[PDB]
Amino acid sequence: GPAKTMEEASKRSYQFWDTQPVPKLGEVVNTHGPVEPDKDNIRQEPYTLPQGFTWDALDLGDRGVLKELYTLLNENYVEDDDNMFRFDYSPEFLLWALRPPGWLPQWHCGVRVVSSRKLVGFISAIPANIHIYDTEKKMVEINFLCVHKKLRSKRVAPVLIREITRRVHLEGIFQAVYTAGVVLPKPVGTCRYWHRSLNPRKLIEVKFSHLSRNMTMQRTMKLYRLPETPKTAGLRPMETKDIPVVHQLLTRYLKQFHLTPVMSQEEVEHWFYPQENIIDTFVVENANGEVTDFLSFYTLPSTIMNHKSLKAAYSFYNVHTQTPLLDLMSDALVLAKMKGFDVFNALDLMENKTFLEKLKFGIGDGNLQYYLYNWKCPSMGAEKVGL
């Protein structure tokens, strides 16, 4: 079905993506710029869906409609290689991910069955200023492309991609950014997920991890046993007064990478201000009262498809200026362990390879490919991806 390796991607032919303004897989890119110019007259009519299906923009402020969306995502969205785990989306998490500053309701693009009005498709866009090499451009982040399992392999994904493209074209944006575990034309970077076990018994019980060849259950827990409290002086939850300095640290820290977001202070508030079961941010306030570092990870539980529920933490943004990142992420592990997380997940992007092995992370079986729509630029190493 999908190609997960570049070698596996040699087989595939892209009947759809060959038509899109994206670089070709095999081609080596030595340029910076769009694949196609801006279109100055935009199709006003929605693209045709297969018979019995119609468009409907999802008003996530409506409770029942938002319930349809997570019920769709909780039952039909991204899975593991072995169909054993699926993300478990809270209504509040979707509001956090789908209603950042500048969100537009028409960018909550759903597909319903005409006769029943049942939600069977979705795709999203949120506004995002992206720094890529020497260029900053207003783009969108495309996420939650989802087709109901009963509708699969019926060419609905190209329509969602092309309709969301049209609705973004109407608002004047011509580039987009998105990530995926499958290989498409053409990844600008490939990042690898690593996993840090916090509650090995539960992880091993549900077969999320295995005991390495020669450990026992009680040996494994001692290997991954963490301090009961964090090491770092003056580590505390982020507060409203920290929003400017958090924005300041994040802005300067991201400048060393080649693929980063460019956040306003209001966007920084939305994405980092702690929300229970959604996002946690802890700042380091030193002996002078200045905030010099922060760590963050978001909450995204996993549903166990055999089935009760696996709570996982995902590294988000971790900025260091005076506190070693190793000690910053070690505190993150401890803070996540307190909060009851079973596993701490992080990609090998940014500076994360410098601490992954030392902090007892184990490499995962899934990659995350980063893509740009209508933007031709050289690929980058994972450590240059800051998105």
Binding site: V78, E79, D80, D81, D82, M84, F85, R86, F87, N143, Y178, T179, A180, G181, Y193, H195, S197, F208, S209, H210, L300, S302, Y314, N345, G362, I363, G364, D365, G366, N367, L368
Partner: peptide, 8 residues
């Protein structure tokens, strides 16, 4: 996060 990884 647009991928689900397990420890390999």
């Amino acid at each position: 996060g647009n991928c689900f990884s397990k420890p390999r």
